[PDB]
Symmetry: C2
């Protein structure tokens, strides 16, 4: 039964060997492969990658920030931004005044809707929440999402598939694996389900040119067993979670790699 | 270099062996796996599956119908429906009167937008068109799409990833592989690119209980080389394509299997 992180490492190795040169928005070079997918078990372990130390404290704090629906840059330590992955998760489509305003009952609450659907119809094939890159929002009518998150329930287990239209394999991907796995753990918890799988799918999976040498070194590292994630308290509403409620156990990573 | 159809067949075999019982909307039973992906080359071949005869005539005619943006059931042979995968592809968000009405310049033209972005910025990570199941549209505010299609360009090749939130593996999937491969061929053609890969990703990948025995028989069949798809004329606008313009060559399928 091979370690899940071997998928991530093989994807890296695949982009290095077979990726094509392609520029991003800013004209910065990448090696790119289109279409990738990996599956991480959430059953009695937590996919916090071990071939480098992943910034767990930042993962947790930024997810809790997003769950608050905040547009206050200063509320997050790891300023009116307008809409961001929080305002869209909790107040989807509501007309935005300022970050201090009262948005209660305004717009679609995509996150509460996912949780309520899990509890009203676990078979539903439509348990879907999307996030937008803020910069796309004024660019065009009906802009595409950056990321779509689909949940799935069978046998009292909650799985999650995250589809991102692009994925920065060196910096963003390890961080997003941990972030959506954590979201799945929180949702499973409040809905009385057990976490099942996290599945990560990408469109443009890329490695920035300046990350090649650090990733080549990362690839020489053998994964250690994944840690465990324990929630320390019985928590009722998704808004009630605090950073204090979570303990990562048995995390034995290789050293930090700075990318970038 | 294994035949691409071996992916489809292994996915079938995987759901039969490892799928969990799960009911659909109507309470009809399936075996289900969450999260799957396969990649089909579009380079000098066309992924029209060969372990059964796929209804190519219907694939082509229904795609041409969708591209017209029609809501006239009778215009398709393989009645005012309101919004359907055509009205959303061509007139996304426009207020719908009746099927005979003039919708020119009304709503977002997702399909023309994809084509125009390919030609104005081939590096764009946002070349995305979505489709909705008509029945979801009045159910809630901001309903989830049924399917998201992302295009990708590198080295003068056009690839396409289709993510569907659920996929009926026996009936719908072979048909959708051919449909999006064909769309990729048409778009590649008008943008002066070569088709690259079609990547098919699913959320709830399922086999209806009544399809088990026919699929078990299908699995005993060896794939033949894929056919070729030739476009017979130089075509300029996506609206100009006619069924007459397309010829499938070298298609040598095993017999039709009726599912259901």
């Amino acid at each position: 039964p091979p370690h899940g992180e071997l998928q991530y490492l093989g994807q890296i190795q695949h982009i290095l060997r077979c990726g094509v040169r392609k520029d991003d928005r800013t004209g910065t070079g990448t090696l790119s492969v289109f279409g990738m997918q990996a599956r991480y078990s959430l059953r009695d372990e937590f996919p916090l990658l071990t071939t480098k130390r992943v910034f767990w404290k930042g993962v947790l704090e930024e997810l809790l920030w997003f769950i608050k629906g905040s547009t206050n840059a200063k509320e997050l330590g790891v300023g009116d931004l307008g809409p961001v992955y929080g305002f869209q998760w909790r107040h989807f489509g509501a007309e935005y005044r300022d970050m201090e305003s009262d948005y209660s009952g305004q717009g679609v609450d995509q996150l509460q809707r996912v949780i309520d659907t899990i509890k009203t119809n676990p078979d539903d094939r439509r348990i879907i929440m999307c996030a937008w890159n803020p910069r796309d929002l004024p660019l065009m009518a009906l802009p595409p999402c950056h990321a779509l998150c689909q949940f799935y329930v069978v046998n009292s287990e909650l799985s999650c598939q995250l589809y991102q239209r692009s994925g920065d394999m060196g910096l963003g991907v390890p961080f997003n694996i941990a972030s959506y796995a954590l979201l799945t753990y929180m949702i499973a918890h409040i809905t009385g389900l057990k976490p099942g799988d996290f599945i990560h799918t990408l469109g443009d999976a890329h490695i920035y040119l300046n990350h090649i040498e650090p990733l080549k070194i990362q690839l020489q590292r053998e994964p250690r067993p994944f840690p465990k994630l324990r929630i320390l308290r019985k928590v009722e509403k998704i808004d009630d979670f605090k950073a204090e409620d979570f303990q990562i156990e048995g995390y034995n990573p290789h050293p930090t790699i700075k990318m970038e």
